[PDB]
Design a protein around this ligand. Structure first.
Ligand SMILES: Nc1ncnc2c1ncn2[C@@H]1O[C@H](COP(=O)(O)OP(=O)(O)O)[C@@H](O)[C@H]1O
Ligand SMILES: Nc1ncnc2c1ncn2[C@@H]1O[C@H](COP(=O)(O)OP(=O)(O)O)[C@@H](O)[C@H]1O
Ligand SMILES: Cc1ncc(C[n+]2csc(CCOP(=O)(O)OP(=O)(O)O)c2C)c(N)n1
Ligand SMILES: Cc1ncc(C[n+]2csc(CCOP(=O)(O)OP(=O)(O)O)c2C)c(N)n1
Ligand SMILES: O=C(O)C(=O)Cc1ccc(O)cc1
Ligand SMILES: O=C(O)C(=O)Cc1ccc(O)cc1
Ligand SMILES: [Mg+2]
Ligand SMILES: [Mg+2]
Lengths: 537, 533
């Protein structure tokens, strides 16, 4: 039994549990769509921009805990996706990007949108921000290369893949051989028994232990192991900003967010100098995770760092126990050992009204801009994985589009995106996509008529000497939503906002809420933060 | 002991000496010192766009219309990666565009800096290396001047192309000696043909029984329009253009064969593929797919193929040459003229284009996006004015013209600028019309609204027997309401009378305007039928 190479690719994605392929067609890509529509299993989602498709696949992957897939044509289709894939790379999200390539017979002749070394070399452009970027050389190799891509994306530190597919091989016949995922990728690494024993001993004798949980908790699906571990030991848990929702913030052991826009309670605990044993789980300990590598984060007695990526361990802080292992496998081992032992509207008011009306199981997507500060600082995240923020690359527009992918991954749950107006101008056209497929997402646009953080930067770092941040005329997002077939509310009082949010939650359609916001409002942690840029200059 | 300026102010001053007038982009923390220097100097004006891709497109459109360097800027990480498609288009169209990007401070390298853009994070220099002539990080403030001059010389020498300069945020404000140079001091002139090649070409022309010229986009790059015209008139040799080279030759001229290749004209096809052309002169064309009807062997002439190109790597690539001239097209045409003289010897889209032809002033610059608008514009619009037809066909990126048109208007503020674009392309970059509203840049967008991806829809019918639809929107976008949302006046046109009145209204306005034209998605555009094969 034979199938086209591209159908084999689609069938192998089927066995990984892939449900959607986000993208925009093109001539050389049409065999992929022909295969998808023939199989009636994976559903294609047409987006407005391939960057939006990459964002959506990234949002789908993070919420589903599965592989996200997007596709793009030769040349400018693929290059349009790059920012989204770079975000996936920075956030360790498994996203597979399928791109088309011209036929082999046209290499080096000036083919339309030629995407080889002789034209626009997509394989090379994507190499720095993917775990693997490769062109399928022959139809016979489609199988091996697809399994390689799927194994690479989801093994070790997860990350995106770029697979480039020449249009002439795509429909060549190949043996129909699909494998279950267990047969072509391996399991997760665990800690050694001696490392488990040594950590348990450090915990038993510690007089002021603490946990810093990062985004690796989501990557590892380690939420309930982390919660059980903390309750079993009494150890309080802080999270990184991106790590928000790894631990329930209404829990008695929750310190809140440590770092940028974080909570005084976490800062006091971890920088006091009193913590003797600090356990870092799944954080790369970059700038915003550490208040620019504050030396006071160093504990008194031992720093324990657990990471699946051995290159992150001991990078910025010397470690006393450095565990290279999956976070959930490490926490399980620790639990077992310890147990068997026996031993306009102010944005803060906006967030507050959201907290009072949003169901507990709401998945909140937050963009990049002042909404980082307001969401990270002012929103209480009780549900595991329910706070979705892209802080690895912090690309404007990420949350605007990724929330659509998130809703497709969790159709039973409310999905809300908190975004700025300039971010919405970058990728807000995608709400037309939500309208087209009736994907109920609510966008809350903090409409401050320009680039808030930039505006505040001009005031605090540049003496208000110039303005490259304020629009001379704010965008009317309700009219824009109307033009794209999405219901809208304008909110200028918190009462109007609450009525809009309550209408939007009930409606079963996409909806947009245009919130009037003062561009001069100083968001939490921003004041304390400008100095790093000043220090940099 | 001489006066010093910040490294970033040196960069601005050196750009001033190249005649740069605008910098298109979006600010970011690490990029702020560049904006401080620009506003300090009060000469180059910054243009805040909606998306960094829009900034790269506008720089490309500005460069192509001005004949000068276009400049855009983006912050670390995702600001820069958002510009990439526009820079890739400049690379494919041989357009000199300088992209300035920020980098984190060097003290943070390898530590997980915010939007870290090094080998340890998102490696901008590597990402951009394939689609720039030069991609480089300024290592030290002291190197700012040499690296900036190197970028400007690289962008505008040989075959023009884009440049990526990455600037660490700490370097940007370090003092450097105030050393600025005129462009002639750090880049050279253009290459000319040898006397022997000129004489051989003149001889081949004198003896040819059916000569022909195929003029490509290199004519615009070389600013060679008058020399081409005078050469054609002196010799009586008819001129076809490539699709992208459209407007390199006046199409109302008795010697014009029109466009050869994709969406081209039968008169050109008959003339060049008949088999009777004995001497073919190719000037500034890469002879890619659409330029040659997929490398049709019949294009080969009977007696001699003469190819003139500034890039030696293009000569003889797809067709064997008899005279391969590595030189600038303008210097080559001037030498040939001198030698020969001294010798002594909904609405149907065709009705939309027709109505445009009947109303656009003669000096209008027409930007055409990528989609079925390619076929309608290349085939049905008669371009009489040198360089007034702007289509990005090197990469043919959807949305290119939507944003590029704004750059073109800043480059030619006294001429009418009109963009012919599809609805899906406008969904991709149409937010930039807000930039035109903010800066009061009068461009007219003509959106061919057929409710989805027309070319893809036609490919489904003609190549996949209509087995699936991944092209038709369930609901059309309302571009009048969208334009209104962005503060741009708009018209909806369902009859050619509505369209004519709307175009007349847009032209008189002198503010930006959008015309939302109802178009049938089933219409087969010219030359598409002969394609899909
Ligand atoms: N399954 C896993 N188990 C443990 N650590 C992981 C796992 N998956 C990813 N990681 C690690 O988690 C870290 C996440 O870092 P990052 O995305 O910067 O988040 P944060 O902002 O919370 O530091 C990376 O060091 C990565 O190696
Ligand atoms: N000043 C110049 N003189 C001659 N040729 C040039 C000049 N500038 C660029 N070129 C050449 O013109 C060609 C343009 O090719 P391309 O952009 O593919 O347009 P077309 O679609 O008309 O072939 C390239 O071969 C390039 O080397
Ligand atoms: C693609 C991209 N370009 C630029 C930046 C730099 N940047 C960070 S915040 C900001 C302003 C965001 O404005 P808006 O979305 O309106 O948010 P606000 O700060 O006004 O709430 C910019 C440009 C970025 N993060 N991503
Ligand atoms: C960025 C990008 N993505 C995809 C393509 C492939 N492509 C070529 S034409 C086309 C459809 C264009 O639709 P629209 O702008 O509405 O024009 P129409 O064909 O309907 O007139 C697409 C997707 C492209 N050229 N550029
Ligand atoms: O954090 C960043 O890099 C931003 O993009 C926001 C910003 C912009 C300008 C400033 O002067 C300070 C901060
Ligand atoms: O020309 C291209 O490559 C396109 O992207 C438009 C297109 C899309 C699908 C087809 O089946 C044929 C043409
Ligand atoms: Mg804003
Ligand atoms: Mg269309």
């Amino acid at each position: 039994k034979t199938v086209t190479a591209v159908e084999l690719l689609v069938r192998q994605m089927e066995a990984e549990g892939v449900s959607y392929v986000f993208g925009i067609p093109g001539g050389p890509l049409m065999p992929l769509y022909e295969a998808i529509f023939s199989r009636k299993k994976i559903q294609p989602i047409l987006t407005k921009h391939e960057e939006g498709a990459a964002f959506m696949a990234e949002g789908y992957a993070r919420v589903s805990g599965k592989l996200g897939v997007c596709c793009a044509t030769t040349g400018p289709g693929a290059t349009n996706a790059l920012t989204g894939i770079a975000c996936a790379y920075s956030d360790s999200t498994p996203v597979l990007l399928l791109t088309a390539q011209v036929g082999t017979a046209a290499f080096g002749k000036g083919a339309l949108q030629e995407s080889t070394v002789h034209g626009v070399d997509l394989v090379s452009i994507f190499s720095p921000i993917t775990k693997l970027s490769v062109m399928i050389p022959t139809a016979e190799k489609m199988g091996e290369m697809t399994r390689r891509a799927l194994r690479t994306a989801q093994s070790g530190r997860p990350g995106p893949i770029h697979l480039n597919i020449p249009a002439d091989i795509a429909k060549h016949p190949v043996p129909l051989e699909v494998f279950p995922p267990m047969n072509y990728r391996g399991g997760k690494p665990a800690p050694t028994i001696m490392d488990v024993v040594r950590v348990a001993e450090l915990i038993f004798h510690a007089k002021r232990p603490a946990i810093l949980a990062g985004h690796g908790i989501e990557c590892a699906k380690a939420w309930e192991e982390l919660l059980d571990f903390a309750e079993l030991t009494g150890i309080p848990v802080a999270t990184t900003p991106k790590g928000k929702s790894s631990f329930p913030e209404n829990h008695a052991l929750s310190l809140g967010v440590f770092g940028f826009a974080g909570h005084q309670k976490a800062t006091d605990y971890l920088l006091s100098g009193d913590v003797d044993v600090l356990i870092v789980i799944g954080s790369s300990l970059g700038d915003w995770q550490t208040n620019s590598w504050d030396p006071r984060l160093t504990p008194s007695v031992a720093l324990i760092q657990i990471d699946i990526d051995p290159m992150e361990i001991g990078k910025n802080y010397p470690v006393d126990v450095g565990i290279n292992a999956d976070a959930s496998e490490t926490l399980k081992a620790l639990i077992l050992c310890i147990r068997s032992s026996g031993k306009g509207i102010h944005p803060a008011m906006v967030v507050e009204a959201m907290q009072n009306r949003l169901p507990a199981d709401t998945i909140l997507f937050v963009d990049n801009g002042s909404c980082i500060n307001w969401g990270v600082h002012c929103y209480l995240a009780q549900t595991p994985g329910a706070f979705q923020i892209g802080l690895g690359l912090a690309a404007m527009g990420h949350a605007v589009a990724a929330a659509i992918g998130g809703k497709l991954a969790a159709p039973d749950r409310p999905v809300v995106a908190l975004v700025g107006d300039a971010a919405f101008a970058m990728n807000g056209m995608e709400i037309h996509t939500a309208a087209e497929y009736k994907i109920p997402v609510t966008w809350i646009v903090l409409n401050n008529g320009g680039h808030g953080l930039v505006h505040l930067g001009e005031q605090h770092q540049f003496d208000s000497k110039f303005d490259i941040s304020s629009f001379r005329k704010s965008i009317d997002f309700c009219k824009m939503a109307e033009s794209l077939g999405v219901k809208s509310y304008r909110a200028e009082t918190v009462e109007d906002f609450d009525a809009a949010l309550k209408g939007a939650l009930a409606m079963n359609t996409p909806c947009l809420i245009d919130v009037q916001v003062d561009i001069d409002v100083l968001p939490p942690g921003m004041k304390q933060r400008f100095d790093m840029l000043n220090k940099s200059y």
